[PDB]
Amino acid sequence: KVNQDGSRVLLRDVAKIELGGENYDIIAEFNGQPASGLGIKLATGANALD
Amino acid sequence: DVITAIKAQNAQVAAGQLGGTPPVKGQQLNASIIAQTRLTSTEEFGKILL
């Protein structure tokens, strides 16, 4: 906005402009510690070993 | 006018859970909100504010 006295109401004055993530739904930790990871899965027919 | 009513009036909205996305310390109930959802009859269809 731009209120009558002609001030400024920008996002800082209404939204807390942060920087988190898409989802806050998966929380993971390795050895009881905060961590992330990727569940690498096996393409059909390729060799698990290779 | 008729078309654009059968739209708004008969549609399917979205509305977050309660917790899920990052919540507050020590919360307890997560539930899913159920907003607008499609009519299902000539009855409810009969009744549309035109």
PDB file of N, CA and C in Angstrom:
ATOM      1  N   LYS A   1       0.810  -1.225   0.000  1.00  0.00           N
ATOM      2  CA  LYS A   1       0.000   0.000   0.000  1.00  0.00           C
ATOM      3  C   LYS A   1       0.840   1.270   0.000  1.00  0.00           C
ATOM      4  N   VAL A   2       0.138   2.402   0.016  1.00  0.00           N
ATOM      5  CA  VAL A   2       0.678   3.785   0.103  1.00  0.00           C
ATOM      6  C   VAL A   2      -0.347   4.738   0.862  1.00  0.00           C
ATOM      7  N   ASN A   3      -0.549   4.457   2.152  1.00  0.00           N
ATOM      8  CA  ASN A   3      -1.489   5.176   3.033  1.00  0.00           C
ATOM      9  C   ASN A   3      -1.550   6.700   2.833  1.00  0.00           C
ATOM     10  N   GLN A   4      -2.702   7.265   3.216  1.00  0.00           N
ATOM     11  CA  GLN A   4      -3.079   8.680   3.047  1.00  0.00           C
ATOM     12  C   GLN A   4      -2.042   9.743   3.400  1.00  0.00           C
ATOM     13  N   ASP A   5      -1.442   9.686   4.598  1.00  0.00           N
ATOM     14  CA  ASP A   5      -0.262  10.532   4.928  1.00  0.00           C
ATOM     15  C   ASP A   5       0.941  10.271   3.961  1.00  0.00           C
ATOM     16  N   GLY A   6       0.819   9.218   3.144  1.00  0.00           N
ATOM     17  CA  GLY A   6       1.678   9.022   2.009  1.00  0.00           C
ATOM     18  C   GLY A   6       2.925   8.284   2.402  1.00  0.00           C
ATOM     19  N   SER A   7       2.926   7.709   3.618  1.00  0.00           N
ATOM     20  CA  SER A   7       4.020   6.812   4.070  1.00  0.00           C
ATOM     21  C   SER A   7       4.367   5.637   3.050  1.00  0.00           C
ATOM     22  N   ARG A   8       4.400   4.403   3.571  1.00  0.00           N
ATOM     23  CA  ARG A   8       4.760   3.192   2.832  1.00  0.00           C
ATOM     24  C   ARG A   8       4.355   2.083   3.750  1.00  0.00           C
ATOM     25  N   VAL A   9       3.586   1.154   3.219  1.00  0.00           N
ATOM     26  CA  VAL A   9       3.432  -0.135   3.880  1.00  0.00           C
ATOM     27  C   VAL A   9       3.903  -1.226   2.891  1.00  0.00           C
ATOM     28  N   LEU A  10       5.138  -1.677   3.067  1.00  0.00           N
ATOM     29  CA  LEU A  10       5.666  -2.733   2.240  1.00  0.00           C
ATOM     30  C   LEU A  10       5.697  -4.053   3.026  1.00  0.00           C
ATOM     31  N   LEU A  11       6.182  -5.126   2.413  1.00  0.00           N
ATOM     32  CA  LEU A  11       5.949  -6.464   3.003  1.00  0.00           C
ATOM     33  C   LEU A  11       6.539  -6.641   4.414  1.00  0.00           C
ATOM     34  N   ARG A  12       7.724  -6.052   4.642  1.00  0.00           N
ATOM     35  CA  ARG A  12       8.419  -6.066   5.935  1.00  0.00           C
ATOM     36  C   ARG A  12       7.473  -5.639   7.052  1.00  0.00           C
ATOM     37  N   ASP A  13       6.446  -4.865   6.679  1.00  0.00           N
ATOM     38  CA  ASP A  13       5.511  -4.316   7.653  1.00  0.00           C
ATOM     39  C   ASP A  13       4.298  -5.226   7.711  1.00  0.00           C
ATOM     40  N   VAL A  14       4.391  -6.512   7.354  1.00  0.00           N
ATOM     41  CA  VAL A  14       3.164  -7.378   7.358  1.00  0.00           C
ATOM     42  C   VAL A  14       3.483  -8.873   7.140  1.00  0.00           C
ATOM     43  N   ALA A  15       4.470  -9.071   6.314  1.00  0.00           N
ATOM     44  CA  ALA A  15       4.955 -10.385   6.128  1.00  0.00           C
ATOM     45  C   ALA A  15       6.353 -10.460   6.707  1.00  0.00           C
ATOM     46  N   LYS A  16       6.595 -11.555   7.429  1.00  0.00           N
ATOM     47  CA  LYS A  16       7.937 -11.878   7.869  1.00  0.00           C
ATOM     48  C   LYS A  16       8.915 -12.533   6.776  1.00  0.00           C
ATOM     49  N   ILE A  17       9.175 -11.826   5.652  1.00  0.00           N
ATOM     50  CA  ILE A  17      10.090 -12.277   4.515  1.00  0.00           C
ATOM     51  C   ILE A  17      11.332 -13.072   4.978  1.00  0.00           C
ATOM     52  N   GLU A  18      11.150 -14.373   5.066  1.00  0.00           N
ATOM     53  CA  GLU A  18      12.201 -15.219   5.548  1.00  0.00           C
ATOM     54  C   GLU A  18      13.100 -15.940   4.502  1.00  0.00           C
ATOM     55  N   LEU A  19      13.124 -17.266   4.524  1.00  0.00           N
ATOM     56  CA  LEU A  19      13.730 -18.068   3.481  1.00  0.00           C
ATOM     57  C   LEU A  19      13.746 -19.464   4.061  1.00  0.00           C
ATOM     58  N   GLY A  20      12.602 -20.131   4.111  1.00  0.00           N
ATOM     59  CA  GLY A  20      12.570 -21.547   4.428  1.00  0.00           C
ATOM     60  C   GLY A  20      12.344 -22.422   3.186  1.00  0.00           C
ATOM     61  N   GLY A  21      11.617 -23.521   3.392  1.00  0.00           N
ATOM     62  CA  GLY A  21      11.482 -24.506   2.331  1.00  0.00           C
ATOM     63  C   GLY A  21      10.105 -24.735   1.750  1.00  0.00           C
ATOM     64  N   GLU A  22      10.022 -25.705   0.860  1.00  0.00           N
ATOM     65  CA  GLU A  22       8.784 -25.970   0.233  1.00  0.00           C
ATOM     66  C   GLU A  22       7.810 -26.583   1.218  1.00  0.00           C
ATOM     67  N   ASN A  23       8.273 -27.626   1.874  1.00  0.00           N
ATOM     68  CA  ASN A  23       7.459 -28.371   2.800  1.00  0.00           C
ATOM     69  C   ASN A  23       8.197 -28.336   4.078  1.00  0.00           C
ATOM     70  N   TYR A  24       7.414 -28.298   5.163  1.00  0.00           N
ATOM     71  CA  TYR A  24       7.917 -28.541   6.543  1.00  0.00           C
ATOM     72  C   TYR A  24       7.153 -29.782   7.049  1.00  0.00           C
ATOM     73  N   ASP A  25       7.582 -30.954   6.563  1.00  0.00           N
ATOM     74  CA  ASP A  25       6.851 -32.212   6.695  1.00  0.00           C
ATOM     75  C   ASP A  25       7.759 -33.385   6.915  1.00  0.00           C
ATOM     76  N   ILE A  26       8.966 -33.309   6.353  1.00  0.00           N
ATOM     77  CA  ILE A  26      10.071 -34.299   6.491  1.00  0.00           C
ATOM     78  C   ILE A  26      11.158 -33.717   7.372  1.00  0.00           C
ATOM     79  N   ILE A  27      11.271 -34.297   8.548  1.00  0.00           N
ATOM     80  CA  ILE A  27      12.326 -33.890   9.433  1.00  0.00           C
ATOM     81  C   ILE A  27      13.231 -35.081   9.648  1.00  0.00           C
ATOM     82  N   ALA A  28      14.533 -34.925   9.366  1.00  0.00           N
ATOM     83  CA  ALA A  28      15.440 -36.070   9.484  1.00  0.00           C
ATOM     84  C   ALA A  28      16.737 -35.795  10.188  1.00  0.00           C
ATOM     85  N   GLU A  29      17.192 -36.778  10.965  1.00  0.00           N
ATOM     86  CA  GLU A  29      18.493 -36.673  11.635  1.00  0.00           C
ATOM     87  C   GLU A  29      19.313 -37.983  11.702  1.00  0.00           C
ATOM     88  N   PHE A  30      20.601 -37.893  11.404  1.00  0.00           N
ATOM     89  CA  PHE A  30      21.464 -39.042  11.532  1.00  0.00           C
ATOM     90  C   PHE A  30      22.147 -39.099  12.860  1.00  0.00           C
ATOM     91  N   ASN A  31      22.029 -40.243  13.547  1.00  0.00           N
ATOM     92  CA  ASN A  31      22.534 -40.462  14.936  1.00  0.00           C
ATOM     93  C   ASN A  31      22.006 -39.400  15.830  1.00  0.00           C
ATOM     94  N   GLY A  32      20.699 -39.359  16.006  1.00  0.00           N
ATOM     95  CA  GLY A  32      20.064 -38.245  16.714  1.00  0.00           C
ATOM     96  C   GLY A  32      20.501 -36.817  16.405  1.00  0.00           C
ATOM     97  N   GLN A  33      21.018 -36.549  15.212  1.00  0.00           N
ATOM     98  CA  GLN A  33      21.515 -35.208  14.861  1.00  0.00           C
ATOM     99  C   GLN A  33      20.780 -34.604  13.587  1.00  0.00           C
ATOM    100  N   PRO A  34      20.556 -33.276  13.527  1.00  0.00           N
ATOM    101  CA  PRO A  34      19.867 -32.735  12.333  1.00  0.00           C
ATOM    102  C   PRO A  34      20.605 -33.025  11.020  1.00  0.00           C
ATOM    103  N   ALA A  35      19.911 -33.722  10.087  1.00  0.00           N
ATOM    104  CA  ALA A  35      20.504 -34.155   8.788  1.00  0.00           C
ATOM    105  C   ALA A  35      19.512 -34.192   7.661  1.00  0.00           C
ATOM    106  N   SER A  36      20.031 -34.215   6.446  1.00  0.00           N
ATOM    107  CA  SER A  36      19.233 -34.529   5.286  1.00  0.00           C
ATOM    108  C   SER A  36      19.872 -35.677   4.606  1.00  0.00           C
ATOM    109  N   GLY A  37      19.137 -36.217   3.598  1.00  0.00           N
ATOM    110  CA  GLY A  37      19.542 -37.398   2.754  1.00  0.00           C
ATOM    111  C   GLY A  37      18.683 -37.673   1.541  1.00  0.00           C
ATOM    112  N   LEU A  38      19.061 -38.656   0.730  1.00  0.00           N
ATOM    113  CA  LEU A  38      18.319 -38.916  -0.509  1.00  0.00           C
ATOM    114  C   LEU A  38      18.224 -40.384  -0.584  1.00  0.00           C
ATOM    115  N   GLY A  39      17.010 -40.882  -0.863  1.00  0.00           N
ATOM    116  CA  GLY A  39      16.709 -42.269  -0.731  1.00  0.00           C
ATOM    117  C   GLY A  39      17.055 -43.052  -1.957  1.00  0.00           C
ATOM    118  N   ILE A  40      18.322 -43.090  -2.343  1.00  0.00           N
ATOM    119  CA  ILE A  40      18.622 -43.530  -3.692  1.00  0.00           C
ATOM    120  C   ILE A  40      18.076 -44.877  -4.039  1.00  0.00           C
ATOM    121  N   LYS A  41      17.118 -44.983  -4.949  1.00  0.00           N
ATOM    122  CA  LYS A  41      16.520 -46.290  -5.421  1.00  0.00           C
ATOM    123  C   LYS A  41      16.936 -46.926  -6.817  1.00  0.00           C
ATOM    124  N   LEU A  42      16.772 -48.253  -6.949  1.00  0.00           N
ATOM    125  CA  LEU A  42      17.368 -48.999  -8.087  1.00  0.00           C
ATOM    126  C   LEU A  42      16.530 -49.017  -9.355  1.00  0.00           C
ATOM    127  N   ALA A  43      17.024 -48.313 -10.390  1.00  0.00           N
ATOM    128  CA  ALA A  43      16.404 -48.415 -11.690  1.00  0.00           C
ATOM    129  C   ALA A  43      16.271 -49.913 -12.077  1.00  0.00           C
ATOM    130  N   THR A  44      15.062 -50.263 -12.536  1.00  0.00           N
ATOM    131  CA  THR A  44      14.688 -51.583 -12.981  1.00  0.00           C
ATOM    132  C   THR A  44      15.650 -52.234 -13.967  1.00  0.00           C
ATOM    133  N   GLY A  45      16.213 -53.346 -13.554  1.00  0.00           N
ATOM    134  CA  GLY A  45      17.189 -53.977 -14.356  1.00  0.00           C
ATOM    135  C   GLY A  45      18.586 -53.477 -14.154  1.00  0.00           C
ATOM    136  N   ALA A  46      18.853 -52.254 -13.754  1.00  0.00           N
ATOM    137  CA  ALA A  46      20.286 -51.942 -13.635  1.00  0.00           C
ATOM    138  C   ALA A  46      20.871 -52.654 -12.432  1.00  0.00           C
ATOM    139  N   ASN A  47      22.204 -52.775 -12.386  1.00  0.00           N
ATOM    140  CA  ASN A  47      22.887 -53.540 -11.291  1.00  0.00           C
ATOM    141  C   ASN A  47      23.136 -52.778  -9.961  1.00  0.00           C
ATOM    142  N   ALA A  48      22.552 -53.289  -8.862  1.00  0.00           N
ATOM    143  CA  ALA A  48      22.538 -52.584  -7.605  1.00  0.00           C
ATOM    144  C   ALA A  48      23.957 -52.331  -7.305  1.00  0.00           C
ATOM    145  N   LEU A  49      24.762 -53.260  -7.785  1.00  0.00           N
ATOM    146  CA  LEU A  49      26.112 -53.290  -7.365  1.00  0.00           C
ATOM    147  C   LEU A  49      26.869 -52.246  -8.127  1.00  0.00           C
ATOM    148  N   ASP A  50      26.514 -52.017  -9.374  1.00  0.00           N
ATOM    149  CA  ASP A  50      27.244 -51.073 -10.212  1.00  0.00           C
ATOM    150  C   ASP A  50      26.747 -49.647 -10.101  1.00  0.00           C
TER     151      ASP A  50
ATOM    152  N   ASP B   1     -23.934 -14.810 -17.311  1.00  0.00           N
ATOM    153  CA  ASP B   1     -24.312 -14.673 -15.891  1.00  0.00           C
ATOM    154  C   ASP B   1     -24.632 -16.053 -15.358  1.00  0.00           C
ATOM    155  N   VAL B   2     -25.497 -16.813 -16.009  1.00  0.00           N
ATOM    156  CA  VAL B   2     -25.666 -18.184 -15.580  1.00  0.00           C
ATOM    157  C   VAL B   2     -24.387 -18.980 -15.542  1.00  0.00           C
ATOM    158  N   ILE B   3     -23.639 -19.026 -16.649  1.00  0.00           N
ATOM    159  CA  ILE B   3     -22.364 -19.793 -16.696  1.00  0.00           C
ATOM    160  C   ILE B   3     -21.482 -19.494 -15.434  1.00  0.00           C
ATOM    161  N   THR B   4     -21.240 -18.207 -15.225  1.00  0.00           N
ATOM    162  CA  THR B   4     -20.289 -17.687 -14.274  1.00  0.00           C
ATOM    163  C   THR B   4     -20.868 -17.613 -12.860  1.00  0.00           C
ATOM    164  N   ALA B   5     -21.240 -18.766 -12.307  1.00  0.00           N
ATOM    165  CA  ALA B   5     -22.115 -18.880 -11.150  1.00  0.00           C
ATOM    166  C   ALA B   5     -22.102 -20.335 -10.939  1.00  0.00           C
ATOM    167  N   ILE B   6     -22.712 -21.069 -11.859  1.00  0.00           N
ATOM    168  CA  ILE B   6     -22.375 -22.513 -11.922  1.00  0.00           C
ATOM    169  C   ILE B   6     -20.861 -22.801 -11.777  1.00  0.00           C
ATOM    170  N   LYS B   7     -19.996 -21.821 -12.091  1.00  0.00           N
ATOM    171  CA  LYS B   7     -18.569 -21.878 -11.738  1.00  0.00           C
ATOM    172  C   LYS B   7     -18.309 -21.654 -10.267  1.00  0.00           C
ATOM    173  N   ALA B   8     -18.288 -20.387  -9.831  1.00  0.00           N
ATOM    174  CA  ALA B   8     -18.123 -20.028  -8.393  1.00  0.00           C
ATOM    175  C   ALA B   8     -18.943 -20.887  -7.457  1.00  0.00           C
ATOM    176  N   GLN B   9     -20.236 -20.991  -7.701  1.00  0.00           N
ATOM    177  CA  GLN B   9     -21.128 -21.778  -6.856  1.00  0.00           C
ATOM    178  C   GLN B   9     -20.787 -23.239  -6.766  1.00  0.00           C
ATOM    179  N   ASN B  10     -20.398 -23.828  -7.906  1.00  0.00           N
ATOM    180  CA  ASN B  10     -20.027 -25.262  -7.955  1.00  0.00           C
ATOM    181  C   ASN B  10     -18.550 -25.549  -8.284  1.00  0.00           C
ATOM    182  N   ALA B  11     -17.670 -25.504  -7.299  1.00  0.00           N
ATOM    183  CA  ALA B  11     -16.253 -25.589  -7.541  1.00  0.00           C
ATOM    184  C   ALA B  11     -15.683 -26.285  -6.327  1.00  0.00           C
ATOM    185  N   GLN B  12     -14.384 -26.191  -6.096  1.00  0.00           N
ATOM    186  CA  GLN B  12     -13.743 -27.170  -5.232  1.00  0.00           C
ATOM    187  C   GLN B  12     -12.563 -26.402  -4.742  1.00  0.00           C
ATOM    188  N   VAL B  13     -12.620 -25.951  -3.506  1.00  0.00           N
ATOM    189  CA  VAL B  13     -11.566 -25.054  -3.051  1.00  0.00           C
ATOM    190  C   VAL B  13     -10.435 -25.711  -2.295  1.00  0.00           C
ATOM    191  N   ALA B  14      -9.503 -24.931  -1.769  1.00  0.00           N
ATOM    192  CA  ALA B  14      -8.340 -25.499  -1.076  1.00  0.00           C
ATOM    193  C   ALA B  14      -8.303 -24.787   0.212  1.00  0.00           C
ATOM    194  N   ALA B  15      -7.702 -25.400   1.248  1.00  0.00           N
ATOM    195  CA  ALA B  15      -7.655 -24.851   2.636  1.00  0.00           C
ATOM    196  C   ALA B  15      -6.753 -25.660   3.544  1.00  0.00           C
ATOM    197  N   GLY B  16      -5.559 -25.168   3.871  1.00  0.00           N
ATOM    198  CA  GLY B  16      -4.609 -25.939   4.688  1.00  0.00           C
ATOM    199  C   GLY B  16      -5.114 -26.865   5.805  1.00  0.00           C
ATOM    200  N   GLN B  17      -4.196 -27.630   6.412  1.00  0.00           N
ATOM    201  CA  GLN B  17      -4.486 -28.517   7.553  1.00  0.00           C
ATOM    202  C   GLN B  17      -4.729 -27.686   8.833  1.00  0.00           C
ATOM    203  N   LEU B  18      -4.034 -27.980   9.935  1.00  0.00           N
ATOM    204  CA  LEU B  18      -3.988 -27.069  11.084  1.00  0.00           C
ATOM    205  C   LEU B  18      -2.508 -27.013  11.457  1.00  0.00           C
ATOM    206  N   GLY B  19      -1.921 -28.145  11.805  1.00  0.00           N
ATOM    207  CA  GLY B  19      -0.488 -28.139  12.052  1.00  0.00           C
ATOM    208  C   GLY B  19       0.427 -28.143  10.838  1.00  0.00           C
ATOM    209  N   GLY B  20       0.736 -29.379  10.413  1.00  0.00           N
ATOM    210  CA  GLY B  20       1.481 -29.791   9.200  1.00  0.00           C
ATOM    211  C   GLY B  20       2.693 -28.992   8.755  1.00  0.00           C
ATOM    212  N   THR B  21       2.383 -27.835   8.230  1.00  0.00           N
ATOM    213  CA  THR B  21       3.414 -27.008   7.698  1.00  0.00           C
ATOM    214  C   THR B  21       3.953 -26.542   9.024  1.00  0.00           C
ATOM    215  N   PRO B  22       5.042 -25.767   9.053  1.00  0.00           N
ATOM    216  CA  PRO B  22       5.679 -25.547  10.313  1.00  0.00           C
ATOM    217  C   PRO B  22       4.655 -24.905  11.239  1.00  0.00           C
ATOM    218  N   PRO B  23       4.404 -25.566  12.378  1.00  0.00           N
ATOM    219  CA  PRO B  23       3.511 -25.082  13.388  1.00  0.00           C
ATOM    220  C   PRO B  23       4.249 -24.320  14.523  1.00  0.00           C
ATOM    221  N   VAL B  24       3.541 -24.223  15.658  1.00  0.00           N
ATOM    222  CA  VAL B  24       3.984 -23.527  16.860  1.00  0.00           C
ATOM    223  C   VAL B  24       4.516 -24.559  17.780  1.00  0.00           C
ATOM    224  N   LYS B  25       5.409 -24.154  18.670  1.00  0.00           N
ATOM    225  CA  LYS B  25       5.778 -25.026  19.788  1.00  0.00           C
ATOM    226  C   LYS B  25       4.584 -25.716  20.448  1.00  0.00           C
ATOM    227  N   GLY B  26       4.829 -26.954  20.837  1.00  0.00           N
ATOM    228  CA  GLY B  26       3.856 -27.775  21.548  1.00  0.00           C
ATOM    229  C   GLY B  26       2.425 -27.691  21.082  1.00  0.00           C
ATOM    230  N   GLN B  27       2.179 -27.994  19.821  1.00  0.00           N
ATOM    231  CA  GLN B  27       0.811 -28.019  19.363  1.00  0.00           C
ATOM    232  C   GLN B  27       0.297 -29.435  19.454  1.00  0.00           C
ATOM    233  N   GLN B  28      -0.997 -29.617  19.245  1.00  0.00           N
ATOM    234  CA  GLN B  28      -1.552 -30.942  19.413  1.00  0.00           C
ATOM    235  C   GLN B  28      -2.478 -31.453  18.358  1.00  0.00           C
ATOM    236  N   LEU B  29      -3.563 -30.727  18.112  1.00  0.00           N
ATOM    237  CA  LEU B  29      -4.417 -31.069  16.972  1.00  0.00           C
ATOM    238  C   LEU B  29      -3.887 -30.508  15.603  1.00  0.00           C
ATOM    239  N   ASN B  30      -3.708 -31.473  14.702  1.00  0.00           N
ATOM    240  CA  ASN B  30      -3.584 -31.266  13.286  1.00  0.00           C
ATOM    241  C   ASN B  30      -4.923 -31.800  12.836  1.00  0.00           C
ATOM    242  N   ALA B  31      -5.668 -31.019  12.060  1.00  0.00           N
ATOM    243  CA  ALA B  31      -6.785 -31.573  11.242  1.00  0.00           C
ATOM    244  C   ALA B  31      -6.907 -30.961   9.838  1.00  0.00           C
ATOM    245  N   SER B  32      -7.696 -31.600   8.988  1.00  0.00           N
ATOM    246  CA  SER B  32      -7.731 -31.097   7.651  1.00  0.00           C
ATOM    247  C   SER B  32      -8.999 -30.286   7.511  1.00  0.00           C
ATOM    248  N   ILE B  33      -8.892 -29.014   7.090  1.00  0.00           N
ATOM    249  CA  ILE B  33     -10.057 -28.185   6.794  1.00  0.00           C
ATOM    250  C   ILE B  33     -10.728 -28.587   5.493  1.00  0.00           C
ATOM    251  N   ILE B  34     -12.055 -28.542   5.498  1.00  0.00           N
ATOM    252  CA  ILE B  34     -12.802 -28.908   4.335  1.00  0.00           C
ATOM    253  C   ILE B  34     -13.670 -27.749   3.838  1.00  0.00           C
ATOM    254  N   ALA B  35     -13.133 -26.932   2.937  1.00  0.00           N
ATOM    255  CA  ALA B  35     -13.862 -25.786   2.392  1.00  0.00           C
ATOM    256  C   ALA B  35     -14.822 -26.218   1.298  1.00  0.00           C
ATOM    257  N   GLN B  36     -15.203 -25.257   0.449  1.00  0.00           N
ATOM    258  CA  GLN B  36     -16.247 -25.456  -0.576  1.00  0.00           C
ATOM    259  C   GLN B  36     -16.035 -26.732  -1.324  1.00  0.00           C
ATOM    260  N   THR B  37     -17.127 -27.453  -1.600  1.00  0.00           N
ATOM    261  CA  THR B  37     -17.032 -28.645  -2.463  1.00  0.00           C
ATOM    262  C   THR B  37     -18.270 -28.977  -3.260  1.00  0.00           C
ATOM    263  N   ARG B  38     -18.022 -29.343  -4.514  1.00  0.00           N
ATOM    264  CA  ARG B  38     -19.022 -29.446  -5.588  1.00  0.00           C
ATOM    265  C   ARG B  38     -20.423 -29.887  -5.150  1.00  0.00           C
ATOM    266  N   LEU B  39     -21.442 -29.261  -5.736  1.00  0.00           N
ATOM    267  CA  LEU B  39     -22.839 -29.632  -5.547  1.00  0.00           C
ATOM    268  C   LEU B  39     -23.026 -31.048  -5.973  1.00  0.00           C
ATOM    269  N   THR B  40     -24.080 -31.721  -5.582  1.00  0.00           N
ATOM    270  CA  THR B  40     -24.201 -33.087  -6.059  1.00  0.00           C
ATOM    271  C   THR B  40     -25.620 -33.430  -6.322  1.00  0.00           C
ATOM    272  N   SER B  41     -26.359 -32.516  -6.927  1.00  0.00           N
ATOM    273  CA  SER B  41     -27.781 -32.765  -7.162  1.00  0.00           C
ATOM    274  C   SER B  41     -28.513 -31.663  -7.956  1.00  0.00           C
ATOM    275  N   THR B  42     -29.641 -32.019  -8.572  1.00  0.00           N
ATOM    276  CA  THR B  42     -30.456 -31.045  -9.268  1.00  0.00           C
ATOM    277  C   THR B  42     -31.065 -30.112  -8.260  1.00  0.00           C
ATOM    278  N   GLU B  43     -31.143 -30.599  -7.041  1.00  0.00           N
ATOM    279  CA  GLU B  43     -31.590 -29.788  -5.934  1.00  0.00           C
ATOM    280  C   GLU B  43     -30.673 -28.619  -5.691  1.00  0.00           C
ATOM    281  N   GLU B  44     -29.482 -28.917  -5.206  1.00  0.00           N
ATOM    282  CA  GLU B  44     -28.524 -27.881  -4.923  1.00  0.00           C
ATOM    283  C   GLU B  44     -28.242 -27.063  -6.158  1.00  0.00           C
ATOM    284  N   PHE B  45     -28.439 -27.667  -7.326  1.00  0.00           N
ATOM    285  CA  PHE B  45     -28.241 -26.903  -8.540  1.00  0.00           C
ATOM    286  C   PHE B  45     -29.329 -25.894  -8.751  1.00  0.00           C
ATOM    287  N   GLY B  46     -30.559 -26.351  -8.565  1.00  0.00           N
ATOM    288  CA  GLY B  46     -31.741 -25.477  -8.551  1.00  0.00           C
ATOM    289  C   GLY B  46     -31.533 -24.175  -7.789  1.00  0.00           C
ATOM    290  N   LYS B  47     -30.797 -24.266  -6.685  1.00  0.00           N
ATOM    291  CA  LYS B  47     -30.626 -23.123  -5.832  1.00  0.00           C
ATOM    292  C   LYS B  47     -29.324 -22.440  -6.110  1.00  0.00           C
ATOM    293  N   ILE B  48     -29.257 -21.559  -7.097  1.00  0.00           N
ATOM    294  CA  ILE B  48     -28.039 -20.748  -7.241  1.00  0.00           C
ATOM    295  C   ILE B  48     -28.299 -19.245  -7.359  1.00  0.00           C
ATOM    296  N   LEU B  49     -27.787 -18.487  -6.411  1.00  0.00           N
ATOM    297  CA  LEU B  49     -27.993 -17.051  -6.460  1.00  0.00           C
ATOM    298  C   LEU B  49     -27.514 -16.446  -7.812  1.00  0.00           C
ATOM    299  N   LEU B  50     -28.457 -16.114  -8.696  1.00  0.00           N
ATOM    300  CA  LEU B  50     -28.057 -15.634 -10.030  1.00  0.00           C
ATOM    301  C   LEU B  50     -28.113 -14.133 -10.092  1.00  0.00           C
TER     302      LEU B  50
END
